[PDB]
């Protein structure tokens, strides 16, 4: 039923051919998963500004790893925030009828 320990290794081999790096993006979800500041799944989409080859390098090196992920937390928290595009508080509800 429910997923216990969301593993990234087995997660990869847990999806069809082309569904390789489909789920956990390239390699950021695994890295962000480690931190989980804002949202691993969504954070990944943002860091995805680089080549799949760069994210691999960072994943094998904390130096570049945190470099990109860390930034994510700052940027995304700012850019990737709550969509304030909601309705106005001055919305007429009561219709002045007879």
């Amino acid at each position: 039923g429910p997923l216990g320990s969301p593993l990234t290794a087995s997660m990869l081999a847990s999806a069809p051919p082309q569904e390789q790096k489909q789920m956990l993006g390239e390699r950021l979800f695994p890295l962000i998963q480690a931190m989980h500041p804002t949202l691993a799944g969504k954070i990944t989409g943002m860091l995805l500004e680089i080549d799949n080859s760069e994210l691999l390098h960072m994943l094998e090196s904390p130096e570049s790893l945190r470099s990109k992920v860390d930034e994510a937390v700052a940027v995304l928290q700012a850019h990737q925030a709550k969509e304030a595009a909601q309705k106005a508080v001055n919305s007429a509800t009561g219709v002045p009828t007879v």
Binding site: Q18, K21, Q22, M46, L48
Partner: peptide
């Protein structure tokens, strides 16, 4: 001080290694 980061808020997260070439 409102400087951008290394990993901006790029698009969504898709299959990076989409190696579906047969």
């Amino acid at each position: 001080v409102l400087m951008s980061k290394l990993s901006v808020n790029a698009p969504e997260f898709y299959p990076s290694g989409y190696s579906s070439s047969y």
